[PDB]
Amino acid sequence: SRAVYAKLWASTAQYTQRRHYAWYQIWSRVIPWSVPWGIFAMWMVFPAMPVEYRQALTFGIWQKPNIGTHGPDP
Amino acid sequence: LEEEQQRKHLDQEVTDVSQLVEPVSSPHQTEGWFKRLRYWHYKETAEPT
Numbered sequence A: 001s002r003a004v005y006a007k008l009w010a011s012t013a014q015y016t017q018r019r020h021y022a023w024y025q026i027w028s029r030v031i032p033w034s035v036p037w038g039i040f041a042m043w044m045v046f047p048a049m050p051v052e053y054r055q056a057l058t059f060g061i062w063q064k065p066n067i068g069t070h071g072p073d074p
Numbered sequence B: 001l002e003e004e005q006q007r008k009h010l011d012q013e014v015t016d017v018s019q020l021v022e023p024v025s026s027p028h029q030t031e032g033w034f035k036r037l038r039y040w041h042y043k044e045t046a047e048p049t
């Protein structure tokens, strides 16, 4: 019947929308890889920033190294 | 049968560019900003339901 043939033709009318739904599915699996790569980036540029900023991103945990040199002058 | 009963233009003798056959296609077709070429045939646009 022509009615049946019409519904079969229309079954694939929303190709473009289904490709967009594919985009979402794949990008949701891939986007978490930004965290490992992000940690390493900050890890690399941390020593090139000022001392004042290095103590802020760590909540006062980080401090200058104490190796026993360059102490105050009497 | 069409190929043996119809005449061909290339079998006639012409001598000047002004006597060449005129195409049945119209030159007025594709329009747009910065569209240099003005005549085309085929496209890949999707057909609807």
Ligand SMILES: CCCCCCCCCCCCCCCCCC(=O)OC[C@H](COP(=O)([O-])OCC(O)COP(=O)([O-])OC[C@@H](COC(=O)CCCCCCCCCCCCCCCCC)OC(=O)CCCCCCCCCCCCCCCCC)OC(=O)CCCCCCCCCCCCCCCCC
Residues within 6 Å of the ligand: A035, A039, A042, A043, A044, A046, A047, A057, A058, A061, A062
């Ligand atoms: C069962 C088995 C058990 C076995 C036994 C146990 C096993 C384990 C034992 C291990 C023991 C230790 C072993 C030693 C390890 C360490 C030593 C070591 O290795 O040192 C390296 C050693 C020397 O080390 P070093 O450089 O002296 O170390 C200096 C320090 O790094 C000094 O660094 P720095 O001072 O410059 O910077 C430090 C700074 C660095 O700081 C930074 O860079 C960033 C700081 C700011 C971070 C801001 C974060 C903001 C967001 C916070 C979010 C919070 C969420 C909370 C949620 C709460 C929920 C309730 O960090 C801090 O200040 C401290 C951090 C405090 C803040 C807390 C936050 C931390 C970050 C957290 C990130 C998120 C984590 C979770 C993620 C997942 C969830 C989301 O180097 C060598 O030996 C080099 C040798 C030569 C190597 C040659 C390599 C090959 C060369 C050829 C290459 C070409 C060929 C290719 C080859 C490729 C081969 C692969």
Ligand SMILES: CCCCCCCCCCCCCCCCCC(=O)OC[C@H](COP(=O)([O-])OCC(O)COP(=O)([O-])OC[C@@H](COC(=O)CCCCCCCCCCCCCCCCC)OC(=O)CCCCCCCCCCCCCCCCC)OC(=O)CCCCCCCCCCCCCCCCC
Residues within 6 Å of the ligand: B030, B031, B032, B033, B034, B035, B036
């Ligand atoms: C108070 C002062 C204010 C000053 C600011 C300006 C104020 C202006 C107010 C004007 C008010 C009255 C006029 C309103 C007109 C509105 C038109 C409109 O919206 O369209 C309606 C209507 C829209 O309907 P539509 O369905 O979209 O039709 C579109 C057509 O299908 C189109 O497609 P088609 O297939 O029909 O056409 C063929 C198509 C395709 O044709 C081709 O592809 C053929 C091309 C052949 C080229 C062969 C060249 C060979 C020779 C080369 C020589 C050597 C050069 C290389 C060597 C260089 C060495 C250094 O042709 C074109 O694409 C034409 C290209 C026109 C280029 C003109 C660009 C001028 C830019 C001026 C500078 C602007 C600022 C720039 C940025 C500054 C920094 C921020 O369009 C038409 O019906 C056609 C009208 C076209 C008019 C074009 C000319 C307008 C000129 C206005 C006056 C400008 C004066 C500027 C100086 C003032 C000094 C004080």
